[PDB]
Amino acid sequence: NTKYNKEFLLYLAGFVDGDGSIIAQIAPNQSYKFKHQLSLTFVVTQKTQRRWFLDKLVDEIGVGYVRDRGSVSDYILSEIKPLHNFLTQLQPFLKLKQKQANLVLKIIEQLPSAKESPDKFLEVCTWVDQIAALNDSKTRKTTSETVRAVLD
Amino acid sequence: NTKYNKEFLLYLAGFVDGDGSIIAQIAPNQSYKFKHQLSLTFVVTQKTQRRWFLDKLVDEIGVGYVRDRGSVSDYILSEIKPLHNFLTQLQPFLKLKQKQANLVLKIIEQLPSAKESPDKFLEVCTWVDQIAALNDSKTRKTTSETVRAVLD
DNA sequence: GCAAAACGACGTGAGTCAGTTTCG
DNA sequence: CGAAACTGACTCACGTCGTTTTGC
Ligand SMILES: [Ca+2]
Ligand SMILES: [Ca+2]
């Protein structure tokens, strides 16, 4: 559990509100109990000629990694534990994505419960819909309504 | 000559490195002694549905305004001296556009003498080429090069 | 004659997902 | 099984200028 400097968090919260992304997804995957994986992702996108900035975040956040997708690169942090510790500290400084940040935090906290019950998992999927709605979601396919139909 | 709150500046700098833009332009205009106006502009672009964020900036920076362009809107600050005061205080916290911010300040401090000497005017235009160089310039037409219309 | 506002647009540089695979 | 990586791409939401006009 790394403790982050407020100055670094204040700046990062602004950069995140600008070019960052707090994403919650429901991925159909037949190897999971309820046939769907609950995926959470903290992302920061930037032109690849500026990847040093993203490479810099890896070092300062102390976790995560950068992937190059061509003309653009992404800083990615998926690990649940480090994501919770990070978002807890960043959250109070966010202005545009504070809500989704808190929704993610809530989900990580209900993960073990979600795995125990179909109605809890369904409820959590509902947390996901709200995050998507808060974002500028444009190509979403799997919603909680998709997960419900899975019943029988 | 307002003094801004440190934390407000930390966040804004991040947001600026994210969705902002420090623009320097040489705009051809016959009413000017040297046939070109030196234009400087601080801009923050955002989806129109999130215009509220841009309106809040107007109040917190205490100068400037927001313009609508359809799906997107912009917070714009062109006033030379308030811009200088603003950038001076923001500059120390920028990480991706700190260079262009300093160039703009340097350009401002030098405006009064560039109008005096044709060669000074050209050197300062060099400053705007540099700023464009630092940004992700893609549709630029007027450079210190074209300003060699001075040779006459 | 120049500061500052108005108005418009190119070509991305992002955001926000989807789908498939890995392996403790 | 399930956390986390890996590979992929749609649809913009931006960035970064250009031209023209207002106005003291
Ligand atoms: Ca943005
Ligand atoms: Ca950006």
- Whether any strand C atom is under 7 angstroms from the Cβ of A145: the reply reads no
Q: How many residues does chain A have?
A: 152
Give residue A127's identity as a one-letter amino acid code. W
Residue B48 burial (10 A CB sphere; 0-12, 13-18, 19+): middle
Q: Annotated catalytic, B17?
A: no
Sequence-distant contacts of A51-55: CB under 8 A, at least 24 apart: A53/B95, A53/B96
Cβ count near B65 (within 10 Å): 14
Residue A103 has φ and ψ, to the nearest 5°, of -70, -40
User: How far is ligand 2, taken at its centre, from the CA of residue A46, in Å?
Assistant: 7
Residue A61 burial (10 A CB sphere; 0-12, 13-18, 19+): buried
Experimental resolution (Å): 2.3
* DSSP line for A32-54: STTSEEEEEEEEEEEEGGGHHHH
- Is residue B11 within 8 Å of residue B27, measured between CB atoms? no
Give residue B81's identity as a one-letter amino acid code. K
CATH class in words for A1-152: alpha beta
d(CA B73, CA A13): 21
Residue A90 has φ and ψ, to the nearest 5°, of -75, -45
Sequence-distant contacts of B29-33: CB under 8 A, at least 24 apart: B33/B115
Tokens encoding A71: 């003309």
Give residue B145's identity as a one-letter amino acid code. E
Which chain A residue shows the shortest CA-CA distance from B21? A18
d(CA B97, CA B107): 15
